[PDB]
Design a binder for this molecule. Structure first.
Ligand code: FI9
Length: 103
């Protein structure tokens, strides 16, 4: 129970983060040229919210995997100095910090 409750705590805190804006909704490949081709497994906070709400995480590890996928995707598609990339670095470091401060 504590696994998914912390997952809920951190997910809520990421969803409400100032730097969360590139990750609140799935990237729309029709608006982002090359995204479909470059990013094999899209992931975003709302998709993680949907899976978490639907009970779809077996362990806290799977939730962390989806989160890390959000940020791996971000770093794969965006320059580190891009606005989305910079936000992704803030969000990634935030996630890793929060994750480690519990686990
Ligand atoms: N509604 C938001 C605004 C724009 N937005 C991006 O531009 C983006 C995010 C991640 C990425 O990898 N590439 C582009 C995220 C969705």
């Amino acid at each position: 129970h504590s696994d998914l409750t912390f997952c809920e705590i951190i997910l809520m805190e990421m969803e409400s983060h100032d730097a969360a804006w590139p990750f609140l909704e799935p990237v729309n490949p029709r608006l982002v040229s090359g995204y479909r081709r470059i990013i094999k497994n899209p992931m975003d906070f709302s998709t993680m919210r949907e899976r978490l709400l639907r009970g779809g995480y077996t362990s806290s590890e799977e939730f962390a995997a989806d989160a890390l996928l959000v940020f791996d995707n971000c770093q794969t598609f965006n320059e580190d100095d891009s606005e989305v990339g910079k936000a992704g670095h803030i969000m990634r470091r935030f996630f890793e910090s929060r994750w480690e401060e519990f686990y």
